[PDB]
Structures are given as structure tokens and as C-alpha cells.
Amino acid sequence: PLYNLPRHRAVNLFLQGYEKSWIETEEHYFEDKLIEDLAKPRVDPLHQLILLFSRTALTEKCKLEEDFLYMAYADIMAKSCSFEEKEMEKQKLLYQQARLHDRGAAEMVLQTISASKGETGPMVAATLKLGIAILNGGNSTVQQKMLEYLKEKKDVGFFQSLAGLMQSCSVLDLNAFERQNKAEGLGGEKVLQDDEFTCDLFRFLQLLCEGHNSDFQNYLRTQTGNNTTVNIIISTVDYLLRVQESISDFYWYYSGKDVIDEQGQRNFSKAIQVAKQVFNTLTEYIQGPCTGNQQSLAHSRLWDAVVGFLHVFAHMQMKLSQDSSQIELLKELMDLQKDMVVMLLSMLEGNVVNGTIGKQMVDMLVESSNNVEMILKFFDMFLKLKDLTSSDTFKEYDPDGKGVISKRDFHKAMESHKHYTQSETEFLLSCATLDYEEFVKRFHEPAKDIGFNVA
Amino acid sequence: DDFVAKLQDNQRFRYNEVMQALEEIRDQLLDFHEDLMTHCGIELDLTIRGRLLSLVEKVTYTLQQLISETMVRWAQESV
Numbered sequence: 442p443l444y445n446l447p448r449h450r451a452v453n454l455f456l457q458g459y460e461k462s463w464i465e466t467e468e469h470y471f472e473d474k475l476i477e478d479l480a481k482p483r484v485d486p487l488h489q490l491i492l493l494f495s496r497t498a499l500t501e502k503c504k505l506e507e508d509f510l511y512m513a514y515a516d517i518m519a520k521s522c523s524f525e526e527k528e529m530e531k532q533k534l535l536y537q538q539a540r541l542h543d544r545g546a547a548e549m550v551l552q553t554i555s556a557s558k559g560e561t562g563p564m565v566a567a568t569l570k571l572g573i574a575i576l577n578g579g580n581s582t583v584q585q586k587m588l589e590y591l592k593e594k595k596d597v598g599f600f601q602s603l604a605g606l607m608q609s610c611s612v613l614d615l616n617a618f619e620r621q622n623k624a625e626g627l628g629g630e631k632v633l634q635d636d637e638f639t640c641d642l643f644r645f646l647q648l649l650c651e652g653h654n655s656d657f658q659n660y661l662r663t664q665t666g667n668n669t670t671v672n673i674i675i676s677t678v679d680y681l682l683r684v685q686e687s688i689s690d691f692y693w694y695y696s697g698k699d700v701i702d703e704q705g706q707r708n709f710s711k712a713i714q715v716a717k718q719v720f721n722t723l724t725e726y727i728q729g730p731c732t733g734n735q736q737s738l739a740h741s742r743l744w745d746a747v748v749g750f751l752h753v754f755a756h757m758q759m760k761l762s763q764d765s766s767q768i769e770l771l772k773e774l775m776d777l778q779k780d781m782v783v784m785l786l787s788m789l790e791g792n793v794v795n796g797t798i799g800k801q802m803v804d805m806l807v808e809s810s811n812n813v814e815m816i817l818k819f820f821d822m823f824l825k826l827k828d829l830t831s832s833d834t835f836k837e838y839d840p841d842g843k844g845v846i847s848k849r850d851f852h853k854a855m856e857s858h859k860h861y862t863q864s865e866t867e868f869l870l871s872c873a874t875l876d877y878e879e880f881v882k883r884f885h886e887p888a889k890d891i892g893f894n895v896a
Numbered sequence: 897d898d899f900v901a902k903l904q905d906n907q908r909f910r911y912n913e914v915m916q917a918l919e920e921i922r923d924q925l926l927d928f929h930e931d932l933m934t935h936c937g938i939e940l941d942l943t944i945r946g947r948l949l950s951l952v953e954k955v956t957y958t959l960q961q962l963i964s965e966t967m968v969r970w971a972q973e974s975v
Contacts, residue, residue, distance in 0.1 A: 443924060443931055445908045452900045454932045462937040463952060478968065486971040
């Protein structure tokens with residue numbers, strides 16, 4: 442039966458369909474027309490709109506409400522943000538943030554975090570989209586207004602809130618996945634409990650330090666003005682360490698089934714883009730080589746985090762390189778590996794010769810010795826690939842040239858070229874007749890530039 | 897009302913004629929809401945799908961000028 446039998450329920454369900462499919466359109470490109478209209482001169486029309494929100498964030502009410510004006514003007518505000526055009530638009534972006542950060546709009550982002558303490562509501566989750574879309578260039582005036590405001594109008598309540606924001610947020614936990622596994626066997630609200638808030642927190646925390654503000658990375662550690670001190674640098678390690686155990690254990694569930702389902706790929710990738718994003722905001726506390734910031738982060742439990750991250754890479758690079766259904770996943774899996782070494786490279790830019798910091802990086806490469814040789818040997822599978830397919834012994838092994846030779850004339854070719862051993866030729870022979878010009882283009886390209894920083 | 901009237905039987909008539917003349921019932925034997933969304937979300941990506949594309953262009957919307965003018969005109973002149 443298909444809605445011929447009831448009458449009012451047909452038109453009712455049509456309404457419920459029409460709202461879901463047809464209504465969500467994109468006429469909405471007014472979002473700079475309106476903000477330019479409001480800044481047209483007293484006090485600007487836009488200027489007292491932020492004077493409303495800065496007052497309402499200041500009257501203490503011990504918690505924060507929804508206030509659905511705010512979620513339409515801290516979003517319409519943030520929808521308004523090759524060498525000539527790669528510097529014409531840079532001045533266009535720095536003008537579309539002087540439209541706001543002249544008007545005190547670096548305060549209604551920095552106050553409405555300090556008012557709601559630890560509440561993860563959609564009140565906070567639409568200022569971080571504003572606080573990101575203002576700092577988006579790694580700006581330098583706006584990073585200075587936020588620091589000077591946090592020293593003459595001294596807030597403990599901001600840094601209490603940032604640890605309080607960072608407290609829960611997420612972890613991809615598979616206990617909720619297994620119930621989602623079982624019920625959907627006979628009949629999207631698992632994934633890190635709204636990951637999209639967690640990316641947009643640490644990406645806001647990174648954009649406070651881009652351009653290497655050597656004061657503002659040293660205001661997040663000691664925080665010397667206030668009475669009590671929050672140490673976000675040690676506390677942002679501890680969020681990473683909780684994401685370490687998650688994506689380790691979600692691999693362990695897949696240790697034997699080994700055919701990654703579609704509901705796992707869509708749930709594993711969002712668990713990576715938080716892990717990639719949290720490593721970027723671990724870089725920018727270190728990169729401008731502020732040695733006090735990399736003292737405290739060296740004594741923390743970062744080293745136990747990075748051990749288990751290698752523990753994923755030793756095996757997940759192997760078993761996901763077996764079918765065509767994981768190549769869309771395997772690129773992001775390497776991109777986390779590329780971004781992991783980039784931060785610990787930034788640990789090493791203050792060594793001497795026998796520096797203390799590099800010595801511990803030997804140690805975690807000693808204390809996790811047996812998991813580095815799989816990833817070193819995995820690159821040798823795909824780095825010898827480029828010339829052993831280019832050698833004149835193999836280019837005219839069988840063919841004149843077409844792009845395909847055989848599987849068997851492939852098989853003794855690595856046995857006659859005598860570079861791979863027999864056990865690793867079959868790892869080349871997972872599925873990889875073959876494709877002489879595509880299999881090199883598939884396999885070799887994400888092998889090298891990811892394998893660069895390892896070297 | 898009449899748009900679902902030219903839809904509730906017509907697709908079902910194609911169902912009833914193809915039930916003898918012929919995956920087929922596997923898609924037309926799902927739940928009601930998923931079937932309604934499947935019939936509706938394909939019209940933008942039959943001959944009935946010309947009616948909705950005349951509809952949504954006509955449900956665009958004047959006082960919308962003068963309201964949005966006067967609200968900012970009040971704020972421009974005085975604190």
C-alpha cells in the first residue's frame with residue numbers, strides 16, 4: 442500500500458517530505474549585502490548590535506540560555522568572511538574583519554565563552570564559528586585585542602571555561618557503536634557526540650597563536666596576571682590522549698573481520714579529522730620556538746600518546762591496502778601520519794647536540810621499536826615501485842608498451858629483478874594482469890611525500 | 897490537496913499495471929515516509945515534476961522593502 446488508502450495522511454506526509462527535501466535551498470547570499478548595509482553611517486547600526494550582545498553577556502545569570510537572536514547574528518556575521526589574485530583577496534579578507542573587529546566584535550566572542558562556564562550548548566557552538574571566521578588569516582590585530590583585553594579586564598572565567606569546554610566534548614566510544622551495530626541489524630548520533638564542535642574548538646585555539654605570538658603562547662601556560670592559573674597546554678594534551686585510546690580501540694574491534702563496512706568508514710574518518718586537527722593546534726604552541734612551552738609539554742604524557750598512534754599505523758596501513766574500498770580512507774590515514782611527525786619535528790628545533798628532548802625521541806622510538814619497521818618497510822614496497830616499473834627489463838619484459846603486461850610475467854619480474862623477497866612480492870600482489878601506469882599513480886604518490894618527513 | 901491527488905493513485909496505477917506485466921516491489925514495499933521522500937526528492941537532482949518546479953518558483957513571496965528599510969533607518973539616526 443502506498444498512500445492511496447488514507448487521504449489526510451497522504452497530504453500530511455507530503456508536507457513532512459516537502460520540508461525535508463525541497464525547502465533547504467540557497468537563495469541565502471545576502472550575508473555580505475546585509476552586513477555592508479548595517480555599517481552605513483553617532484553610532485553605526487552594526488555598532489550597537491554588538492553593544493547589545495556585550496551587555497547581555499555581562500549581566501551575570503549563572504548560566505546561558507538559547508537566545509535565538511544570537512544564533513542568527515553570530516552566524517550571519519560569520520558568513521561574511523596567481524600572485525595578484527593571491528594578494529587581492531588577502532586584502533579583501535583583512536577588510537572583512539576590520540568591518541567587525543573595529544566594532545568591539547572581538548569581545549562578544551571573548552565574553553560569551555567566559556560567561557557560560559562548561560555548557561556545550563548551541564550558544565557556544567555559534568560563537569566559535571564566529572571566533573574562527575574572524576581569526577581566519579591568523580590575524581594580528583585581533584590577536585592583540587584579545588590579549589590586551591585579558592590583562593586590563595582580568596578574566597579567570599575565560600580560562601576556567603576553556604578547560605571546562607575542553608573537559609568532555611567527545612571521544613569516539615564503540616560501546617555506543619555496538620548498540621548501534623545491533624539495533625540497525627534489524628531496525629549518525631554516535632560519532633564522537635557532535636565532532637563538529639570539537640574541530641571548531643581546537644581550530645579556534647590554534648588561530649590564537651598563528652603568526653607565532655610569543656606572548657600569547659606564554660599566556661596560555663602560566664597566565665601570570667590572574668590569581669589562579671589554568672594550564673591549557675598540558676590540558677590540551679589530555680584531550681588528545683583520550684582520542685588516542687578511542688581510535689586504537691575502534692581498530693581493535695576490526696582486528697579479525699577486516700572488511701570495513703560503510704558505517705565504519707564514515708565513522709572512522711570523522712574520528713581522524715579531529716585527531717588531525719588537534720595535532721595542528723599542538724604544533725602552534727611549539728613552532729615559534731618558545732622553549733618554556735616545550736619544556737612542560739615534554740614532561741607530559743604526549744609520549745604515551747604518540748606510541749599508540751604508531752600502533753595504529755603499523756597495522757592499519759597494511760590491512761587497508763588490500764582492497765579498492767579503502768583508498769578513499771587510506772589517504773586520510775596517511776595525512777594523520779604526516780601531521781604527527783610535523784609536530785614532533787617542531788619539538789626538535791631547540792636541541793644542542795645531546796639535547797634532552799631529542800633523547801626522549803630516541804626512547805619512544807626505542808620503546809616502540811617493533812612498530813616502526815612495518816611503516817619503514819611499507820614505504821619500500823612502494824618506493825622501489827617507481828623504477829622497477831621504469832626499468833628497461835620490465836618496460837619491454839613482455840610488451841612494446843600498452844599499460845598492461847600480465848600477472849605471471851609480473852610475478853617472476855620481481856623474482857628476476859631481485860629487489861623484493863618472495864614474501865613481500867605477494868604484498869605487492871594483493872590485487873594491485875595489472876595496470877602498468879595506474880598502479881604506480883595510485884600507490885607511489887601518497888608513499889613519498891608522506892614518507893618524506895619520516896626520512 | 898490536488899497536487900497529492902494527482903500523485904497518490906497515478907504512481908500506484910503504474911505499480912498496479914507493472915504488478916502483472918513484470919527490485920520492482922522491493923522499492924515500492926518500503927515504509928511510508930521513506931517512500932514519500934523517495935518520490936519527492938527525485939523531482940530535483942515524470943510529468944508531475946513540472947508542477948512542483950512551477951510551484952517553488954511561485955512560493956518566493958512590497959512591505960518587505962519598507963520594513964527592512966525603516967528598521968535600519970531608525971537605528972541610523974540616533975543612539
